[PDB]
């Protein structure tokens, strides 16, 4: 009975602090693990700038904006899209960041999102 969307506040991490630099070894695994870490409260977000992606591990999981009107309760509506070797699995809007495991690193901010659970 999972609701279609969940309001989450994600810790924003600096890339050089991240200890576990991705979720796994295949597109299906990284999407699965991302969704589990989101449910457990153990997922962080790295904002993408020059130099960030080469310091993280593929496949990547991005959170991308899913619409233009829903910022319900101050949370941007987003969905997950994976990337491996330049091919994306999903099509969505602008990237808010790359998701990574959170294992206790100190964040620099929080990003409020309304996440589509599949
Ligand atoms: N299918 C499911 N994916 C997710 C993603 C985030 C959260 I919180 C719960 C679930 S259950």
From Swiss-Prot:
It comes from the Viruses. Changing residue 39 to R: In strain: Omicron/XBB.1.5, Omicron/EG.5.1. Residues 2-118 are annotated as: Disordered. Residues 4-118 form the CoV Nsp1 globular domain. It is found in: Host cytoplasm. Inhibits host translation by associating with the open head conformation of the 40S subunit. The C-terminus binds to and obstructs ribosomal mRNA entry tunnel. Thereby inhibits antiviral response triggered by innate immunity or interferons. The nsp1-40S ribosome complex further induces an endonucleolytic cleavage near the 5'UTR of host mRNAs, targeting them for degradation. This inhibits the integrated stress response (ISR) in the infected cell by preventing EIF2S1/eIF2-alpha phosphorylation upstream of stress granule formation and depletes host G3BP1. This is Host translation inhibitor nsp1. It comes from Severe acute respiratory syndrome coronavirus 2 (2019-nCoV). The chain holds residues 10 to 126 of 7096 of the full protein.
């Amino acid at each position: 009975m999972e609701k279609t969307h969940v309001q989450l506040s994600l810790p924003v991490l600096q890339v050089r602090d991240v200890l576990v630099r991705g979720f796994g070894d295949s597109v299906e695994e990284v999407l699965s693990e991302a969704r589990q870490h989101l449910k457990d409260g153990t997922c962080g977000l790295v904002e993408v700038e020059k130099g960030v992606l080469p310091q993280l591990e593929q496949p990547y999981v991005f959170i991308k904006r899913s619409d233009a009107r829903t910022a319900p309760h101050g949370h941007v509506m987003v969905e997950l899209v994976a990337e491996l070797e330049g091919i994306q699995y999903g099509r969505s809007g602008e990237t808010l960041g790359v998701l990574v495991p959170h294992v206790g690193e100190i964040p620099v901010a929080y990003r409020k999102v309304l996440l589509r659970k599949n």
